[PDB]
């Protein structure tokens, strides 16, 4: 369908420890597949999906070298950022970067992404034209002038239309979704009331919608819910709950919408 | 395949 590749990079400045803590995580279709961490005993890029383990040794060698390049790029950029914001002392200075490419059925680049944040706030982003920059404040405007002078955008556009799309293509043949499994549990409360908790487990990607209904109609009652959370095995969990009268709970239905399902589920708690 | 940033720093 609409395939994608992302790399999520984080650098946290360090004092007289020269090198910042540098972490990079790569995703294919929103699923982790490679990882680099500078605080490893030997910092290396590593597979994080079984299907990446087939890549040749030179691939891991080339990638690890690029990570050491990034680490140095973030180190100098964090020193520059320190000066852009005058004093502003903190024991935490964080530069984050998101980049990657959305791939279409036609196999061309659909959307390219390159975005930076400093201290948890938008700093600078490449616009969708992959030629101009959006700068969030005075410091990011210094950076933008500098990158317009040196032609930085052309380097990033070339990666996004080229290498990014090309290796996304290859990964999608290497590892040639997972629909929710749902059920309802039943928790009696006091005074003739009971909680109906609709669970969705084992699904991927995280995006899901859970709704309780009475005969095709949504309930005016307020639905208690829980934010979608990782199970720890690559799948996610969610639940929505509702408080109904004891002896009436068979009439209520849970709906589960997820893209791994041709059609949304309908299920209920069935009494004996 | 990871992006190596353009050498001009922030």
């Amino acid at each position, epitope marked *: 369908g609409p395939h994608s590749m992302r790399y999520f990079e984080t650098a946290v400045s360090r004092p007289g420890l020269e090198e910042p803590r540098y972490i990079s995580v790569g995703y294919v279709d929103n699923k982790e597949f490679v990882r680099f961490d500078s605080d490893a005993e030997n910092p290396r890029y590593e597979p994080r999906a079984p299907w990446m383990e087939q890549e040749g040794p030179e691939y891991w060698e080339r990638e690890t070298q690029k990570a050491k390049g990034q680490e140095q790029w973030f180190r100098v950029s964090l020193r520059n950022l320190l000066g852009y914001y005058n004093q502003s002392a903190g024991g935490s200075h964080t530069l984050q970067q998101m980049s990657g490419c959305d791939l279409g059925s036609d196999w061309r680049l659909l959307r390219g992404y390159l975005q930076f944040a400093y201290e948890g706030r938008d700093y600078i982003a490449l616009n969708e034209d992959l030629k101009t920059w959006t700068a969030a404040d005075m410091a990011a405007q210094i950076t933008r002038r500098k990158w317009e002078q040196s032609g930085a955008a052309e380097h990033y556009k*070339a990666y996004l239309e080229g290498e990014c799309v090309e290796w996304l293509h290859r990964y999608l043949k290497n590892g040639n979704t997972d629909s929710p499994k749902a059920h309802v549990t039943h928790h009696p409360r006091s005074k003739g009331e009971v909680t109906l908790r609709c669970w969705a487990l084992g699904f991927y990607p995280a995006d899901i919608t859970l709704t309780w209904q009475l005969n095709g109609e949504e309930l005016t009652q307020d639905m208690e819910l829980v934010e979608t959370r990782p199970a720890g095995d690559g799948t996610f969990q969610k639940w929505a709950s509702v408080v109904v009268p004891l002896g009436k709970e068979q009439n209520y239905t849970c709906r589960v919408y997820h893209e791994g399902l041709p059609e949304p589920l309908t299920l209920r708690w069935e009494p004996p | 395949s990871s992006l*190596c940033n*353009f050498r001009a720093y922030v």
Partner: T-cell receptor, first 108, second 110 residues
Framework: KTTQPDSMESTEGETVHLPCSHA???????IYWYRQVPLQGPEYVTH???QNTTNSMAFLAIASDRKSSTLILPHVSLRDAAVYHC???????????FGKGTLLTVTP | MKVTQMPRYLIKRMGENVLLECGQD?????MYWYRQDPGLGLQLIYI???????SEGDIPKGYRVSRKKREHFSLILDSAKTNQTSVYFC?????????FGPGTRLTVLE
């Protein structure tokens, strides 16, 4: 690594074409041209990634497979005589490796 | 965009110290020290990525560098050898091209 001819001769006023071969170039590597008048400091001329490039002193053309290029010096003066270095420069890399380059002479 | 180098020419006795200085007032992050023997190529001695962030280039033996501020970069020959007779070029970069200084011709004599 790039390959250039050892030397090139022209008379002032002519258009000069300096060829450069770089068949093991990678997608992130720019093509940079520097010149050096002997015993003087080398001087940037131009560079490009794929899209052809025009500036005040020169034109650059890059083949569509990126495996060769040529520097174009429109109406050479005597002051353009120099060694011209074609050098690959990783977009993420600050180092350059200079070769022998092409010695351009221009006679009046 | 201007890189400064003094002196243009220098005579040193064999075994004496040598300090060559390079300046740039645009506060570029990266600076370089090259040497060029006549009729040969420019060879990188050391590159400085930032203050106290220096890496060996192709021919580091017999040299060391100091980068305490971004605006200067110094090349130090602790005990000059005759085969260090050469032309030394320093450079700087912001991320686009390199800007070269006018060079220093050092002659080391017995």
């Amino acid at each position: 690594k790039t390959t250039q001819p050892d030397s090139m001769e022209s008379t002032e006023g002519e258009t000069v074409h300096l060829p450069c071969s770089h068949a093991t170039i990678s997608g992130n590597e720019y093509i940079y041209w520097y010149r050096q008048v002997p015993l003087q400091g080398p001087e940037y001329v131009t560079h490009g990634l794929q899209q052809n490039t025009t500036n005040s002193m020169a034109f650059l053309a890059i083949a569509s497979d990126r495996k060769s290029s040529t520097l174009i010096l429109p109406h050479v003066s005597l002051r353009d005589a120099a060694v011209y270095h074609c050098i690959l420069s990783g977009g993420s890399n600050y180092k350059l490796t200079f070769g022998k380059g092409t010695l351009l002479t221009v006679t009046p | 965009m201007k890189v400064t180098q003094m002196p243009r020419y220098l005579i040193k006795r064999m075994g004496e110290n040598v300090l060559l200085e390079c300046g740039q007032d645009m506060s570029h992050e990266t600076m370089y020290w090259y040497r060029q023997d006549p009729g040969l190529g420019l060879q990188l001695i050391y590159i400085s990525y930032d203050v106290d962030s220096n890496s060996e280039g192709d021919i580091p033996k017999g040299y060391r560098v100091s980068r305490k501020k971004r605006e200067h970069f110094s090349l130090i020959l602790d005990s000059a050898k005759t085969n260090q007779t050469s032309v030394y070029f320093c450079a700087s970069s912001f991320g686009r091209e390199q800007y070269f200084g006018p060079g220093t011709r050092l002659t080391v004599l017995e």
